[PDB]
């Protein structure tokens, strides 16, 4: 009896959502001139990692950035002068993510260790030392992001997320409800909501303050690899192992126009927007990073690394864009 | 040059960092990395604790054989699905699989696990060093005769020991041993197109020669890879 009620309620939901689409984005868009072609050149090349590169994260001042590798190192670079400011050796050799604090006082990392570590950069001594170690998860860490100097949001492989308190080191909220393991999360500019995409081919919306899911989005038939969040705050884009990426809206609660090409077979690994939201930067599996028009489903340009492009990043001021790859090279583009 | 007084110290510090990184790079290329897989019943813990002589995710172990360094990573408290984190281990030298052959009950799931590992797309071009552990319990339980294999594997009745058998104990236990080996090798040799190989063994509960066996198998693996690269094999 309960199953039938759930089925009819789901049917009612999809029917109510169905009677809301009157026009497609493409026909409204047809009255907009295309952006044309985009040309970017490799300004700088940062070298020094041994193994593959899996993560990177820009700084807020738009100069410094941090990257992670499988040999067990974190390196903080000076983008303008290519110098190296720091080099941090890790306890565990298998890491999957890194984050760089908004104030620039801390960095974090995690991986096949079920532990998130916090590193203090500005000390009375001249060395960088670990501050906290946040244990309590079961599966491998796949993402982590800073709220402020005391709050951090983690994504794990045991199909749960969590909100932590760095001062004490105890969880204050656990977000449960994903069927498969979750891989990526993105925050909002107003730091009140965040999304997360998992391997059950669905993405969910969460409320940080009170801590329960508000909306659930579907449409992909394979697992979700990357998720980014629109600069306005009312949309987001996902990236799947289906060689396809979609755009969803938080009010219409529907799949808007999708970006797919007939010459792509491999899934994507990273997604990011530009400052104005006109461009969509996607890192692919066939050694390439394509550039999409976020309104017309056109390939404005191509960014061509000798192995998989694993990570991306766009500066706060929009001046540059960095890419990482499994050949252990970081390139800065504009 | 146009650099300031405080910009030369920055490049000096960067150069010292690069020197340290190059030293670490030289250290990193003389080490071989291994991945250890198995089930809870199989004695992974016993062999890993012998070779060296909380809900953590990985455990790391080091051992030295003939001035060669080996890294053997054991994946610990994870979930029941391995499809996602298995892509990180596509550059190791070899995979080690441990099987408990005394049970006969949960031994069919072991074959499925081995098939899943062998047929993985991210794990091709990587060889497997099969370990067949817990032989003394096998012998004790078969000589008693309380449990019969035919009750679990009815094909065991119509099987005869191979001519290649070299039992260096009994005229029957060897039939069961080589039956289990034949099952695993029948799974192994169904495909593989000559890019990775399987090396069965007869490890016991306590042994002092596992490291030497791993050394020899890794030597053979890398030598075959090099010969194939230069078109000599």
């Amino acid at each position, epitope marked *: 009896q309960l199953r039938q009620e759930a089925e009819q309620l789901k049917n009612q939901i999809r029917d109510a959502r169905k009677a809301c689409a009157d026009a497609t984005l493409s026909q409204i868009t047809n009255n907009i001139d295309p952006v044309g072609r985009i040309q970017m050149r490799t300004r700088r090349t940062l070298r020094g990692h041994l193994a593959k590169i899996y993560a990177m994260h820009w700084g807020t001042d738009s100069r*410094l950035l941090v990257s992670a590798s499988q040999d067990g190192k974190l390196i903080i670079w000076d983008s303008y002068t290519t*110098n190296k400011v720091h080099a941090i050796p890790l306890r565990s050799s298998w890491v999957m993510t890194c984050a760089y604090a908004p104030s620039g006082n801390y960095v974090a990392c995690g991986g096949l260790d079920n532990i998130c570590s916090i590193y203090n950069l500005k000390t*009375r*001594e*001249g060395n960088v030392r670990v501050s906290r170690e946040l244990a309590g998860h079961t599966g491998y860490l796949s993402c982590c992001r800073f709220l402020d100097d005391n709050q951090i949001v983690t994504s794990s492989g045991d199909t749960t997320c969590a909100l932590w308190d760095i001062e004490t080191g105890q969880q204050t909220t656990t977000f449960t409800g994903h069927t498969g393991d979750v891989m990526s999360l993105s925050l909002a500019p107003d730091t009140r909501l965040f999304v997360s995409g998992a391997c059950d081919a669905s993405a969910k919306l969460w409320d940080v303050r009170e801590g329960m899911c508000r909306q659930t989005f579907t449409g992909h038939e394979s697992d979700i690899n990357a998720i980014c969040f629109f600069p306005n705050g009312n949309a987001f884009a996902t990236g799947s192992d289906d060689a396809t990426c979609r755009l969803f809206d938080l009010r219409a609660d529907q799949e808007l126009m999708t970006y797919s090409h007939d010459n792509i077979i491999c899934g994507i690994t990273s997604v990011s927007f530009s400052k104005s939201g006109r461009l969509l930067l996607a890192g692919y599996d066939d050694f390439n990073c394509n550039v999409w028009d976020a309104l017309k489903a056109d390939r404005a340009g191509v960014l061509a690394h000798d192995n998989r492009v694993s990570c991306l990043g766009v500066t706060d001021d929009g001046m540059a864009v960095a890419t990482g790859s499994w050949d252990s090279f970081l390139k800065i583009w504009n | 040059c146009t650099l*300031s*007084a405080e910009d030369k*110290a*920055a490049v000096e510090r960067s150069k*010292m960092i690069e020197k340290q990184l190059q030293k670490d790079k030289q250290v990193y290329r003389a080490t071989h990395r291994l991945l250890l897989l198995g089930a809870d019943n199989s004695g992974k813990s016993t062999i890993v604790k012998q070779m060296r002589i909380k809900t953590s995710g990985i455990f790391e172990t080091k051992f030295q054989v003939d001035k060669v360094n080996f890294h053997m990573f054991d994946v610990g408290a994870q979930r029941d699905e391995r499809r996602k984190w298995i892509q990180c281990f596509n550059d190791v030298t070899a995979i080690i699989f441990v099987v408990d052959s005394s049970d006969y009950n949960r031994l069919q799931e072991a074959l499925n696990d081995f098939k899943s590992i062998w047929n993985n797309r991210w794990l091709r071009t990587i060889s497997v060093i099969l370990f067949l552990n817990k032989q003394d319990l096998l012998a004790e339980k078969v000589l008693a005769g309380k449990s019969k294999i035919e009750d679990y594997f009815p094909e065991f009745a119509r099987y005869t020991t191979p001519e290649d058998a070299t039992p260096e104990e009994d005229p029957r236990v060897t039939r069961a041993k080589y039956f289990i080996r034949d099952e695993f090798l029948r799974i192994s040799t169904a495909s593989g197109d000559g890019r990775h190989y399987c090396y069965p063994h007869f490890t016991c509960s306590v042994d002092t020669e596992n490291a030497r066996r791993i050394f020899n198998d890794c030597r053979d693996i890398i030598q075959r890879m090099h010969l194939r690269q230069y078109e000599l094999l």
Partner: single-chain antibody
Amino acid sequence: VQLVESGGSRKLSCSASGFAFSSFGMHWVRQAPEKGLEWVAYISSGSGTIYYADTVKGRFTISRDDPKNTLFLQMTYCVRSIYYYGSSPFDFWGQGTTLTVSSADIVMTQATSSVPVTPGESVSISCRSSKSLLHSNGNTYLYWFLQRPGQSPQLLIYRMSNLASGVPDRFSGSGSGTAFTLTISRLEAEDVGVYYCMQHLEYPLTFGAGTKLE
């Protein structure tokens, strides 16, 4: 952090204990009995670069011993300094042993020498250099130290605008390229002392003259 030294043809030693001595460059700075500060020598972190004061070059020699965390100066204040993007050099000074010894460089003079003030009122102190300290990259290398009557000098401002770590937020810095000023909004009894002016565009780190506050 606490580096305390005692010594004094003669040899001087400065011993450090409390921080990563191997990541910091070191300096030696001289103070005459009745005259402002003066620079002597400098040794890099990796011992790859060494400079000496133009006045004495053949009679002096510096060396460092990283394993035992000791600094040396040979007769024939020891100050930390670390350089990278966003660092604060000259932040910590030693307990103090002065070194009384019996052209094209940048010279700068402070306008006055003394001024009487009253608590609760703002004060201004001026410095002026021969040539512009603003560089092509954008940094303006100016430092304020504010030695107190009895102790070693401290650090207040670096790069003419950035406030130090532990100093109260009553100090500020501003300038235009050649003329600079330091303003103290409020005032307390702990601000009594003499203030110094420094440049870091070139190796001869020419200090200023001093401005006593009574």
